[PDB]
Each structure stands twice: as structure tokens, then as C-alpha cells.
Design a protein around this ligand. Structure first.
Ligand SMILES: Nc1ncnc2c1ncn2[C@@H]1O[C@H](COP(=O)(O)OP(=O)(O)NP(=O)(O)O)[C@@H](O)[C@H]1O
Ligand SMILES: Nc1ncnc2c1ncn2[C@@H]1O[C@H](COP(=O)(O)OP(=O)(O)NP(=O)(O)O)[C@@H](O)[C@H]1O
Ligand SMILES: O=c1c(O)c(-c2ccc(O)c(O)c2)oc2cc(O)cc(O)c12
Ligand SMILES: [Mg+2]
Ligand SMILES: [Mg+2]
Lengths: 466, 54, 479, 466, 128, 128
């Protein structure tokens, strides 16, 4: 029926109920507030008290303050009316464009598609990005993860993917801001209005926006992912459609969970994280999937705290991905953009039977020459180039030209590169590296391979170096 | 002419190798002390968490 | 008698007072102790209130009476704080009497959402050649200043504050910038010396100084950024522009870790609590650029972070990088060698400031960025010999003293000489000498050309020919 | 009033009072003991019980034993009568020379001088030691990091600073032995007696001594620094002096804080230090400063654990240091006394905006030439000295002369050497080094500048040699 | 069931790194105090009791067998770490794969010196 | 007893590493708070008060003496670990032994570069 707040600590609120006890996952509505304050039931503590997590600030709450059970979990608008609109964790519009008037509402908690619902089909999604398409290619309807420490290029890479992949997509898209910059949301939104994927007059908008950024309390950041994901689920199933789902940044979900976990009275796990890190991520990630009923192509930016890939949060995310793009601060600092670690990024479709033996061979070849170069670097750092056999000097020179030809000017990063953004077709990516490996440009200088599109541009750049 | 060129170049190569080594030392020292501090802190947190859970 | 508006201290010890009663307090409501100390209702539990004490908890005893204030933690706000030195709570500490403050504002206010904003587009001029050219800042931007102890971090902030006098003395209200310096964990003498410096520069009149120094209790150091931010938001929302400096967030996070550990929150990486990112994220999100429909105002933040031995990969440094819109990294090596400001250009960015750089600066700086990029890649053929020759000379041009911030047009005049090759024949040790002689010459004799660059905001085909004239005429006249 | 002991766990004692509770930081006198046992209130536990930290051993204590609340913190004898005397943490004499007959007492806990009470100006505190004043000068009311250890003339440097500050500034000194090794405290005591800075016969004593010895409980060792500082605060506040405060050694202050914190059940921070590391350091260091009335300038010996400058302890300390004096075993072996490393020692106030353009450029010129001299030392062992250019022969000459002119005979070391001690004024120091660089004494032999005061004595020594 | 009815079975546990994490979660939520790396004290025992059930039966008991291939995931190649050495210290040897070998073209990426079979030639045909 | 009666005594504590371990056992089980390496906050004090009892008495007190040679076991050369740090800083100097000197044939395995007596010459005869 009606409950009373008995305890408040940050995002965690205990509520006592006299008659009916709301089940775990139910959305409670705090009475006597100017803006809607939802608490989600996390635990039954005993003695007719439940422990909850607030979806907004808890300043101003008093013990004894009344709370009503809504009778269900947080429910949000889904369907066409979400398109072009921006909503928050609890499905309220946040774009000042009035109510989002939908027929259907869907709960932000749901079970993951069963085993029999899985799709086993594999098809390359070509991005026009050289290092990705060659070494760790994306798959249509696949799970894609972009790993990177602070400032290394996650958001740039996701925006270039929206440019290169979303632009020419005949379905719907969903962008979920999770614990990132509010001004980035403002950037994305106005950019989409300028391009017309979002239309403020028509019903031709192709992208739905969900935001719970780093200005939100943990409860909100811990749940916006589920909200954004729910919007995507509708489109996948109730339209049987091809859906794009961009999330920046999914790490913020796990960090958010971490902030409230102590307040929920859990004994902490490794590095102070919640003991439930892997299952919380499992129940959330396993919903982000293509099913027999429909395809979700997902791209998730994944922050890596203190540049540590063994940190529980990123470490646990790897197994949820069909393709990983790992960005590296050391690679970035060398000026190589996108700062992809070509030996730490993998794809489940990098298989001769899927991509063909030529694509596969050139990739394995590039990777071998890069690994051989890497093994020689201790010797190089102390003694230098001059102590290498002629065979080693050749691996070094070819590898260094290959490293440079993996770099690419992004349309989205033109201000920073000082070059025009480029998109290289797959066949031309394969050919360029096929040729560098064959020794065909051992006569050309390193710098010629840096920040260009196709191999022809490298040649023409070498000529221009007079 | 040859040994005059050789002893200059070996003097230079050895100069550069000694300077590179010196940087690699300072860098590995900083790594060592970051790892030193983490091991101590990690070990303490394991202890604290065990005690607190009693 | 009353246990609804009043409570009594059960225990006090780890900077936290446990209080019986206060049955009617709100979460995050300011409470008052009989001893005059203020506190914040943190923990509301069935049998007690946990209160964070904003001051020395030696003054609180078991039994001490505690009263509600009814007010969610807030601070005095408005234009009366200008020229004042205050503590974390807004109490004056400069001994110049009470603040004639009329308005007040919560410290915990959520940042503007998506709709009220627009991309940054107004220059926030530091007056620092290297920053204004290579790492331009926009109004509403967040730019981290980051580096080891004693790398010139605070100096970047101070020269920026001092710089604003040129705009703040004029009549153009859009070009004005009010300043807030938040001192967290610093030495009190350092802060006293700082307001002295701003006073001498007559910069204090448009500056609020918020101060929670090394002997101020951890919750005061924790609070202080939010307090100054609130004072900043006053301007942001009322069609005005403010700049805030958090000096520094490293010392704030330490203070917060002290509180969290004493609260027995589970320590994580470097014994920091899980919410140490959120600590800085919520604060820095509040620096924003408002669109015209929300007054057009803005708050610009320069958070300072101190690294250990240049390790930008550490937990707190990466936290803040992952919040702000770029960073200015100051290197110990460069500072040692006397390259000052010690800015590492390669590791420095302004993600959003490019759009807020005056066209006049873009015309000279875009090719300097390029020529400096070509230079580090070769740190004896005629092609790559010119790259080293140009690079060392531009390096000398971006060297700058303290407390002499330059007008934007002065900076472009100086950088013009470099990027068009007028230095290439001079010896590097003579570039600094050239700049100061060349600068006070164009200021004295050629006021019209500089005045025109500022007004146009551009270097026109007319100005370019007039500038070529003067530089060539001076170069042959320089000994 | 009077309370009873309810718990004893090592150096932590719990006392229950029937009426009013002693506030935190109050001193409590245990009753029924041979010697005084002070307990400092640390927490109010509730239920009329306080938790205290013992200033001496708790062996023999009974639950129920009476405890008298003193009404204030630890109060110690302050004034000119403490000079030449040795006291402990709680103010007791430990030099066996009877009571310390002061009219005033002062509480060892006090807050830092308020913002209005601060000097807005930075001044040099001239030591009259050439290396110090020229290259890494001391700041009035600042903190200096003394790196050294044994055998490098550290006790002599201290004793001379005490002497030179009394002679030049009319300031008294306080030495606080935090974790003083008993053996070394005795030796230090007699070395001071032997050098004159302590006088048992008359009343010329220039230093007061405060020992917190190694075998004392954590609390005692954590507080002695305050005790010492309080003694010093008398001379600033009541007698308007520019005082000297020695802390030997600051790390042991930090470690005692770490121990106390561990004993009070507080969760340790990074590297196992106290969570209050920075505030413990802040509330003590901020007391060391220039007020409108006078100043305390502190010299603090620093141990760098594991030779890690990024260790929380030295890191925290460095935030407070305005200069460093680095004593070098290499320098001492060259016969240079004081054994100050002229390139390793730094100062925050070595700034023309503070010390003047002439002081600055001469120091820089000295630094530059000693830096240049080292660059040529590899070429010295290879090419020999007679292969250098006429410019480079002259730099070697001048630098070698500068090295020796940086040495100085100390008054405090007259007994050991027979040589008359020198206190060189700042202007004669600047002048002297100014002229060696100019080449005004190139004709002079190198050994004439060694163990000399002002540059006039370098001339008088050169004339005296055959 | 196969092992005890004169048949032979092979079981893959893919992977026991994740099962240890699941057990850690469960143990911590049961309020059992954490041990090394927040794992329960008995995390060796978790896997030791499982893998010991892989066995070869004598003819009296039917001659059946269960063979186990547990999988462990290291972090940054550290086979010497705690959990890995726990499991290595249970099994009859280990096959250690490395990315360095993998990229160099050694595929399968087996590190020979670090891999072992504790059964050796007893498990090979005479010809091999 | 010897020190206080005009006589001279030598005492070897072999070793103080093990003593600390024993006291740690007690503090932990008495549920006193653990610090670094689970040692309690009074372990420095424990050792400092033992070692300060070595002394050279003046003639008024008989002129007797107690000289202490505490032994500490390091782990893999880590003189910066907790107990070594304590006893190193308490004492008047250290004789450092090393494994690699030992097997090089340098026996006694004393590192002469690192070992130090801060008393020094004061304790040598003129001949030596
Ligand atoms: N492809 C690229 N080309 C050129 N510059 C780039 C590229 N990617 C990143 N950068 C530079 O790196 C900065 C950070 O890029 P961004 O995509 O925001 O990284 P991020 O990982 O999302 N940062 P954060 O969210 O703070 O952890 C940009 O402002 C550029 O200066
Ligand atoms: N442009 C400059 N030219 C010459 N000297 C400078 C310059 N900027 C700063 N300094 C000097 O460098 C020192 C440190 O600068 P500061 O601005 O205090 O950096 P910081 O990193 O904030 N120091 P701290 O906060 O104490 O770690 C000061 O003593 C200044 O005198
Ligand atoms: O990287 C780190 C890490 O993993 C842990 C940790 C803590 C508890 C555990 O149970 C565990 O397995 C690891 O502590 C740290 C402490 C630091 O100060 C710095 C770090 O970098 C880490
Ligand atoms: Mg990003
Ligand atoms: Mg500073």
C-alpha cells in the first residue's frame, strides 16, 4: 500500500511498508516532491522494510516521508514516438518538447533472450576504417566494444562509426549516453538536427536518444543503460528490424553500481568493486543482442580506469564482445590515430572461411611483422637500429610503414589531424597492406604512409616529399 | 682513417646506449615504485576486508 | 525538549557526529551545533543522524545540542563576494566585515542538462601565448591544468585571472569575465600571497577567493569547490561569464578519501572510494555554456590536478581527464630546462576551444601548430634542417614570464614574426630579446594596426601587408 | 572532574566520566602512579566514555583507576627558561636539572594563524652560510627539507644555524627530536654544550630541546613536534622573534601519526598511511609561518622511504617545503664544508620577483658554471686539461674557484679546527661570487678561496702564500 | 555416469576462472569473509574437489574413465599468479598458450617449456 | 644485571623478525586493528623499547654496558618492508648480508658498500 522512509544514505533509501511489500525491482514513487523521485526496490531487509536505490537526488528527504508502490518496475515509453526525442532513465522527456505520447510502455528490467533465440549467422560490417576492417573486422548484428583509457579516442571512434555506418542505414538507431559528458549529448543532438537523422518537424527521425550522464547520481547512471537498451529492444522485436545501438559509456554502469554497493551492505570484492559485478553486467549485456526475431548491431565505448585492462570492469567486458577495438595511450602518444592496438584487438569473424583467405592472410601477415618488430624493441631502445641484422632492419622498416598505414584521418577529427577525413573500401585496405608486405614500397619513406586513405595516397605523398 | 672513424662511432654508440639505459632505469624505477605502493595497498585492503566481515 | 527540530550528540570521533533526535531533518540539510559549528545531515538512520562537521570536531562533545536550519546545504551568492576572501561556507576571512549578500544557492545543484546548452564559441583569453594559440579555451569549457608539483600550474590560472582586466575595465559587458579562485589544501600563506598579487594587479575587484587550506578540516576542503561553483553559477545563469579555478582537485580527492575511510567505506584503487570520480564529475559538469534562450552566460572551469612523477595514467588524473574537455600538461623536464610555461604540446588538447579562437590567432597559429608538429618528429639535409631551425625559434617565442599576460592582438603580432620566417636568420639565444624589443615597438609606434586587428578580429589583406612592412623594417633595424 | 578507567588495550585507554566529558584533545592525569601518565582524549564514544591515547606505558593500570580531567590540552612550560633545557612531550624536564621555572604555560594544540594574521610578503631569512643564501636561500617562516643522514656535518650545520640566527636575527631556536634515539639525544646534548649553543653555567643558551624518544608510545612521538612548536610559538607571539624550529625527523612524525591512527581502529589509506595523513601534516605545518608579530622558520630532516619521492609521506611533506638543503657525502669527501650539494639544493624563493634580479642572475651564473664544469669532466679524464679552448680553460678555473668559495668555516666548529668562524652577510656573498664569474680573480690561486668567509679573506689568503 | 559404467568421457570446463568469480560472489553475499584477492579461503578446494573426480577406474570398478580439460584465463600472461597456480597445482599438467607465439605464427600458440604432461609417454601409443 | 653492575654484556636477538610475527599473532587474535602486513600500531614501540635498553652507562652508574645485535630476516632483499624498516631505523647501524656475494665466494657475505656503523671510529683502537 503506502510506505514510510526509515533511512536515507546517498542514493540508498530504506522504506517500511505496513501491509503490502513491493517486490524486488518495483518502482516506488516518493510522495511530497516537486519532481518525480523513483526508488527501485533492491532488497527485502526483513521486518517489513525494503532497501531501494533512488533514480535521482535524495536531498530533502525526511524520515517518515511517504512512498507509494507503483505496482511495477520502472516503465518507459517505447515505439516510434521515442525517435527524435531525448528521454532520461525513467522515460521522462528531457528535450522540452512535451509528452512522448506512446501506445506502449515497457519495463526497463526484462530477462535475456533464451538460448533458442540466438542467431548464429556471421557477416562482415565494413566500416571503412583500415585497422578495424583488416585486423579485427566488425560483424552485422554483432557486439562491438571500444576499449580505451581517458582521452585516447573512444568517443571520436564511436562518432566516426555513426558517420560511416549509421548514415547509410535503412533502420533505426538508439544512442544511450551513460555517465559521459552532458555537453557531448548537446553536441550529438544538434549535430543530428543539422544532418537530419533527427527532424524536429517531420516524423522522419531515425535515432532515439537516452541520457543519464556524469551529472546524475549513481542510481540513475546504474540504470540508464537498461533504459536505452529497452528502447532498442522494442525496435528489434516489435518491428523485426535492423537496429543500431551506441552506448557511451558502458563502464559508467559498472562504476555506478560500485558507488551504491557499499551502501547496500555488500562486503566488497576485488579493488573495492561490488561482489555482483559480473552477474550485473551479464544480466544487462545479455539483453544487448541480435535474436532470430531481429538484429542489433551494438557499439559500446568502454572506459578503462587508470589505463589498466586487467581492472575487473574492462576485464569482465571482453567475453561479452564479438569484436574488440582496444585503443592504447602509448599508440596515441606516437601520433597514431585511431590509436588501435593492432595486436590487442580481435574479432570472432577473423576466420578464413568468413573473410576469405586473402583478407585473413594479409591480416595474419601484418600481425606477424608487428609482433616481430615488438620483440626487437628492447634491443633497439638500448643499442639502436645499427646493431640489427639486415633481415631485422627490413622487418623494422616494413613494420614501421605498416604502423603508419594503419593510421587514418577521420572526418570527425579533421580539426585535430589537419587532414580531410577518409574512408577506405575493404578491397583497397587489403591491397595496400598486401603490397607493403610484398616489399613493394621498401623504397618509399615512412612519413608517406602516415595519415592517408588508400595506398595510392601514400605513393602520391612520397612524390610530394620531392 | 678507419680506426679514427670507428673509435668515434663506438664512442658515440656507447654514449647513446648509456643514455638510453639511463632513461630506461629512471622509467623502470618509477614503475617499480608504483607497483611497490600498489602491492602494499592491495595487501592492506585484503586484510581490512577480512577483518571487517567478521 | 524538542527532538524534531533538535538533537543531542551521541558520539563524536572520526569527524562524524552521531546525533539522537532531529526527527524532522532533511538529507543534506545544514545543521548547527551549540558551539557555532555548522554540519551536514549525511546519514539518516532509524536511531540517529550522521552529521559531517564543517570544522574542528574537537569543539563538539557528547550531549552538545544540535539544531536544524531547515536549509539544504547552501552558500551566499552574488556580486558582493567580488573582492572578498571567504571560507568554504561563505564566511568572510579577509577581516573586511560581513558579505552584503542577498541571494543564496545550494552547493549540490545538478548541472544544466542537454537543452540549455550550446557549443563553446566565446574566447576565454588567458593572455598566455602558448595556451591562446595552441590550446585555445572557450567560455563554458572545462580545461584541466595538470603536472607534477612546482611546474607552473597555479601560474597559468593567475595570469588568466589578471588578463581579464582589459575586458573588465572596458564597457562591453559580453567580453567581461568574473573570476573565482578556489584554494583547496594549499598553504594559507600561499593564498594570502596570491590575493596580494591580484590586488597589486588590480584584479581582485572582479575575483572571489574561496579558501579551505591545509589546516582546514577535510569536509571544508571537500565542500569548497562546490561552494565556489555555486557562486560561479550565479553568473552563468544571469547572462554573465565566470571563470573558476579548483586549485587543486588532487588535494580535494585526498580530503574526500579521508572522510570516506573514516566512514569505513570500502577503499579501492589507491584506497580511494568508488564515488571519487562522481565527486569531480558532478562538480565539473556545472561549468557550462548556456544558449541565448537561457541567458547566454557561461562558467569556465580550470581544475588543477597534481601528478606524481608525470604519471598521467594514475587513477585520479585519468578520472579528471575523462571529465574535462582537454588538458594542459606541464612537464618537469621542460620546466627544469627553463622552458616556461612548461607546456608539453604533444600531450595537450583543447577538445572544444578551436571554435572559440579568434580568426586573427587561427591565421598565424594553424601553421605554427604544423611547424611545431614537424619539429618534435626530428627532435643534415636542407629540407629537415629548416624544420629544426624554425622549431627552436617558435619554442623561444612561446616562452613567457609571469604576470605579463598579452592582449590577443599583441600575441598574433609576435607569432606573425615567427611563422613568416622573420626569425630564421637570428640566433636562438636572441629570440627572447627580439620579441620584447619588437613588442614595445609595435605598441608604442603602431597602435592603429593592433587596434584594427582587435576590432576586425582578423588579419586582413591590408593588415598583412602593413605587418610585413613593420617586421622587415624592424629586423634590419635590430642589432 | 574525575573519571574511571573502563578499558586498557595497549596504548589506548577508555575513561568513563559521571558528569561533564573532557573535550577531544584534553589531557587527562591518571591517579595512583609513580610517574605522570597523561592520556589525550581522542574520541567521544558515547555513553559518557572517552577514548584516549596514552603518553607513556599503560602497564599496571586497573579498570576503575581514577583519572583527573586537566580541563585543557597538554600544557607545557614556555619561555626563556626552557632554553638549554631538555623537556619531553608533556613538558617535564628530562635533563635532571630540576624544574623548568617559567611564568607561562601553553597548550600544545592551537590552530594555525588566521588568514588576516598572514604576511603577504616573502622574505629571505639570511643564514650567513654562502651556499644556502646564494643558491637555495631560506624563507622567513618557511619550511626546509634537510636531506643528509650521518657523517655529512649535519649536527654542525644545525648548531651553526642556531648560532647564526641568534647572531643575525636575534632569534632563538627549538630542536624537536621526533623519534630521537636516546644515545643520539645524549650525544647531541653534549655536542651543543661543547659548541656553546647550550650553556649550563650562565644563561646564553640559544636552543630549547624537546625529545620524543624512540621507546615512547605512538601518541607521545606524534605530539612532540607540537610541544616543540609550542615552545617556539612563545618566542614568535610573545617576543616577536624570527625563530628557528628543527624537526628531527619529519617522517617519524608521520609514522607516529600512522601508528596512532592504526591503534584507534581507523582504516589505513594508500601505502598503509593514516587516512588523515594530509591533515595531520597540515594542522602542524600551518603553525610554522610569518605572522604580523614574527616568524617561525622550520628545518625538517626528511627520510624518504624506499628512496621513493612519490611515497605518500615525502609527497605530503613536499607540499609544505619552501626549500631543500641536500647534504652530500660526495661533497664532504672533497673537503667542502658545509657539505651542501649546490646543484641538488633548491629554493622556491630563488625568484627575481622575491630575492632581486642581481641575487638571481649570480645564483644562476653559479649554477650554470658548475653545470658546465661537470660536462667537461668527461673530457678532462680523456683529453687532459691542456686541450681545452681559452674559454673552456677559464670556466674550469672559475668553477673550481666557485666550488671552494662555497665552503665556509663555522664558528660552532672552532674547537675542532682552531680556524675562526665566519658569518657572511648576504650582500658580501652576492658580491664575492659576482666577481669570480666576471674574471676579477682569475689571476688568484685556486686554494685561496677555500675555507674562507668574505671575498676579502680570499685575497688576504692569496697574499699570504709565499 | 560414463566413468562408473565402463565407458570413457571427456569434460571441458570453459572456464573455471568465471566459476571462481561466481563462487566468490556467492560466498561474499553469504557473508563469508573474503580471502586473497577477495576470493574465499577455500577456492583451491572449489576446484580440487571437482577435478579429482576426473579419474581412471581399475577393471574391478569397470575400467571406465573421466578426463578433464579445465580452462583458466590469465591476465597479461601471468601463469605464475595465485588462481592459475592453484589450478596448475591440481591438474596433471597444463597447456600454456601465449599471444606472442600466436602472432608470431606459432599456432597452436603453445609455450613448450612451460607446458607439461604429468603422465608423459604412458599416455602415448608406442609409435608416438 | 651486568650493565648495571659495572660490567659489560652482549646480547643477540635471533631473530626479531620471528618475535614480531608472534606478537602479531596475539594482536590479531585479540582483535586489535591490523595495519601494514597485518602488524599492529605498537610493533615499532615493541622493538624500540627493547633496543633502547642497550646502553653505555656513565661512571656515576658503574660504567657498565649492554650491546645488542638484533637479527632481522629480509624477504628477497626488501629492507623497506615493515619490520626491517622499523629495526633499521631504531638501530645505530646495519651489517647487510647478501646471497650473491655469498656464492661469489665473498664470505662473510657482508656488503661493505651498504653496511654502516654510525658509532664508527669512536669504537676502533688506533692500530685498526
Ligand atoms: N581519430 C583521431 N584523430 C585525431 N585525433 C584524435 C582521434 N581520436 C582522438 N583524438 C584526440 O584525442 C582527444 C580525445 O578524443 P575522444 O574521442 O574524446 O577520446 P575518449 O576516449 O572518448 N576520452 P574520455 O571520454 O575523456 O575518456 C580528441 O580531442 C583528439 O584531440
Ligand atoms: N612563466 C614563468 N616564468 C618563470 N617562472 C615561473 C613561470 N611560471 C611559474 N614560475 C615559477 O615556478 C614556480 C612554481 O610555479 P607555480 O605556479 O607555483 O606551479 P605549481 O605547480 O602550481 N606549484 P605547487 O602548487 O606549489 O606545486 C614559482 O615559484 C614561479 O616563480
Ligand atoms: O590495481 C590495484 C588493485 O588491483 C588493488 C586490489 C585491491 C584489493 C584486491 O582484493 C585486489 O585483488 C586488488 O589495489 C590497488 C591499490 C592501489 O593503491 C593501487 C592500485 O593500482 C591497486
Ligand atoms: Mg569519450
Ligand atoms: Mg599551485
Amino acid at each position: 500500500t503506502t510506505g514510510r522512509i526509515v533511512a536515507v544514505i546517498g542514493a540508498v533509501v530504506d522504506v517500511q511498508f505496513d501491509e503490502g511489500l513491493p517486490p524486488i525491482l518495483n518502482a516506488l514513487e516518493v510522495q511530497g516532491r516537486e519532481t518525480r523521485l523513483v526508488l527501485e526496490v533492491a532488497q527485502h531487509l526483513g521486518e517489513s522494510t525494503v532497501r531501494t536505490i533512488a533514480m535521482d537526488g535524495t536531498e530533502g528527504l525526511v524520515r517518515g516521508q511517504k512512498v507509494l508502490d507503483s505496482g511495477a518496475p520502472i516503465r518507459i515509453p517505447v515505439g516510434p514516438e521515442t525517435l527524435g526525442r531525448i528521454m532520461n532513465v525513467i522515460g521522462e522527456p528531457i528535450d522540452e518538447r512535451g509528452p512522448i505520447k506512446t501506445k506502449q510502455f515497457a519495463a526497463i528490467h526484462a530477462e535475456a533472450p533464451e538460448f533458442v533465440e540466438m542467431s548464429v549467422e556471421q557477416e562482415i560490417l565494413v566500416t571503412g576504417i583500415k585497422v578495424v576492417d583488416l585486423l579485427a573486422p566488425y560483424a552485422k548484428g554483432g557486439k562491438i566494444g571500444l576499449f580505451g583509457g581517458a582521452g585516447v579516442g573512444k568517443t571520436v571512434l564511436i562518432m566516426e562509426l555513426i558517420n560511416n555506418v549509421a548514415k547509410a542505414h535503412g533502420g533505426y538507431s538508439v544512442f544511450a549516453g551513460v555517465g559521459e559528458r552532458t555537453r557531448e549529448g548537446n553536441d550529438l543532438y544538434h549535430e543530428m538536427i543539422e544532418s537530419g537523422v533527427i527532424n524536429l518537424k517531420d516524423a522522419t527521425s531515425k535515432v532515439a536518444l537516452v541520457y543519464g550522464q556524469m551529472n546524475e547520481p549513481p542510481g540513475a547512471r546504474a540504470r540508464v543503460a537498461l533504459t536505452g537498451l529497452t528502447v532498442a529492444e522494442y525496435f528489434r522485436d516489435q518491428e523485426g528490424q535492423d537496429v543500431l545501438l551506441f552506448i557511451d559509456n558502458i563502464f559508467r554502469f559498472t562504476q555506478a553500481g560500485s558507488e551504491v554497493s557499499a551502501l547496500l551492505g555488500r562486503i566488497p570484492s576485488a579493488v573495492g568493486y561490488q561482489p555482483t559485478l559480473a552477474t550485473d553486467m551479464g544480466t544487462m549485456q545479455e539483453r544487448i543482442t541480435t535474436t532470430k526475431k531481429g538484429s542489433i548491431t551494438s557499439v559500446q565505448a568502454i572506459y578503462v580506469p587508470a589505463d589498466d585492462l586487467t581492472d575487473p570492469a574492462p576485464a569482465t567486458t571482453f567475453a561479452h564482445l564479438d569484436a574488440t577495438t582496444v585503443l592504447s595511450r602509448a599508440i596515441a602518444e606516437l601520433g597514431i590515430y585511431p590509436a588501435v592496438d593492432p595486436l590487442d584487438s580481435t574479432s570472432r569473424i577473423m576466420d578464413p572461411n568468413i573473410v576469405g583467405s586473402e583478407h585473413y592472410d594479409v591480416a595474419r601477415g601484418v600481425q606477424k611483422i608487428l609482433q616481430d618488430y615488438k620483440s626487437l624493441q628492447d634491443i633497439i631502445a638500448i643499442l639502436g637500429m645499427d646493431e640489427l641484422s639486415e633481415e631485422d632492419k627490413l622487418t623494422v622498416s616494413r613494420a614501421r610503414k605498416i604502423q603508419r598505414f594503419l593510421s587514418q584521418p577521420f572526418q570527425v577529427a579533421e580539426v585535430f589531424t589537419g587532414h580531410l577525413g577518409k574512408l577506405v573500401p575493404l578491397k583497397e585496405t587489403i591491397k595496400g597492406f598486401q603490397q607493403i608486405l610484398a616489399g613493394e614500397y621498401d623504397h618509399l619513406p615512412e612519413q608517406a604512409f602516415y595519415m592517408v586513405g588508400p595506398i595510392e595516397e601514400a605513393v602520391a605523398k612520397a612524390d610530394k616529399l620531392a | 682513417e678507419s680506426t679514427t672513424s670507428e673509435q668515434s662511432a663506438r664512442m658515440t654508440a656507447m654514449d647513446n646506449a648509456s643514455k638510453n639505459a639511463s632513461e630506461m632505469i629512471d622509467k623502470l624505477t618509477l614503475t617499480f615504485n608504483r607497483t611497490r605502493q600498489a602491492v602494499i595497498t592491495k595487501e592492506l585492503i585484503e586484510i581490512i576486508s577480512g577483518a571487517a566481515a567478521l | 525538549v524538542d527532538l524534531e527540530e533538535t538533537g543531542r550528540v551521541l558520539s563524536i570521533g572520526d569527524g562524524i557526529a552521531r546525533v539522537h533526535g532531529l526527527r524532522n531533518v532533511q538529507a543534506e540539510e545544514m545543521v548547527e551545533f551549540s558551539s557555532g559549528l555548522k554540519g551536514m545531515s549525511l546519514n539518516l538512520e532509524p536511531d540517529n543522524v550522521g552529521v559531517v562537521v564543517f570544522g574542528n570536531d574537537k569543539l563538539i562533545k557528547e550531549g552538545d545540542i544540535v539544531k536544524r536550519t531547515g536549509a539544504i546545504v547552501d552558500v551566499p551568492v552574488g556580486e558582493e563576494l567580488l573582492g572578498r576572501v571567504v571560507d568554504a561556507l561563505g564566511n568572510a576571512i579577509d577581516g573586511k566585515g560581513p558579505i552584503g549578500s542577498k541571494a543564496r544557492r545550494r552547493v549540490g545543484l545538478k548541472a544544466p542538462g542537454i537543452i540549455p546548452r550550446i557549443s563553446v564559441r566565446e574566447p576565454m583569453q588567458t593572455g598566455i601565448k602558448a595556451v591562446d594559440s595552441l590550446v585555445p579555451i572557450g567560455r563554458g569549457q572545462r580545461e584541466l591544468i595538470i603536472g607534477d608539483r612546482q611546474t607552473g600550474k597555479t601560474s597559468i590560472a593567475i595570469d588568466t585571472i589578471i588578463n581579464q582586466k582589459r575586458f573588465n575595465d572596458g564597457t562591453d559587458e559580453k567580453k567581461k569575465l568574473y573570476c573565482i579562485y578556489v584554494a583547496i589544501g594549499q598553504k594559507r600563506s600561499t593564498v594570502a600571497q596570491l590575493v596580494k598579487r591580484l590586488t597589486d594587479a588590480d584584479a581582485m575587484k572582479y575575483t572571489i577567493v574561496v579558501s579551505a587550506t591545509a589546516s582546514d578540516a577535510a569536509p571544508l576542503q571537500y565542500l569548497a569547490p562546490y561552494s565556489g561553483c555555486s557562486m560561479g553559477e550565479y553568473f552563468r545563469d544571469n547572462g554573465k561569464h565566470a571563470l573558476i579555478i579548483y586549485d587543486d582537485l588532487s588535494k580535494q580527492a585526498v580530503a574526500y578519501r579521508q572522510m570516506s575511510l573514516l566512514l569505513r567505506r570500502p577503499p579501492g584503487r589507491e584506497a580511494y572510494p568508488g564515488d571519487v570520480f562522481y565527486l569531480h564529475s558532478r562538480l565539473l559538469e556545472r561549468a557550462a555554456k548556456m544558449n541565448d534562450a537561457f541567458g547566454g552566460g557561461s562558467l569556465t572551469a580550470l581544475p588543477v590536478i597534481e601528478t606524481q612523477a608525470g604519471d598521467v595514467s594514475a587513477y585520479i588524473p585519468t578520472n579528471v581527464i575523462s571529465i574535462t574537455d582537454g588538458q594542459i600538461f606541464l612537464e618537469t623536464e621542460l620546466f627544469y630546462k627553463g622552458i616556461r610555461p612548461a607546456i608539453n604540446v604533444g600531450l595537450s588538447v583543447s577538445r572544444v576551444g578551436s571554435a572559440a579562437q579568434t580568426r586573427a590567432m587561427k591565421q598565424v597559429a594553424g601553421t605554427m601548430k604544423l611547424e611545431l608538429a614537424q619539429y618534435r618528429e626530428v627532435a643534415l639535409d636542407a629540407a629537415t634542417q629548416q624544420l629544426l631551425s624554425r622549431g627552436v625559434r617558435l619554442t623561444e617565442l612561446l616562452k613567457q614570464g609571469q604576470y605579463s599576460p598579452m592582449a590577443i592582438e599583441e600575441q598574433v603580432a609576435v607569432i606573425y614574426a615567427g611563422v613568416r620566417g622573420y626569425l630564421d636568420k637570428l640566433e636562438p639565444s636572441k629570440i627572447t630579446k627580439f620579441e620584447n624589443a619588437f613588442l614595445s615597438h609595435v605598441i608604442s609606434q603602431h597602435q592603429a594596426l593592433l587596434s584594427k586587428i582587435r576590432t576586425d578580429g582578423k588579419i586582413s589583406e591590408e593588415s598583412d601587408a602593413k605587418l610585413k612592412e613593420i617586421v622587415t623594417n624592424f629586423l634590419a633595424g635590430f642589432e
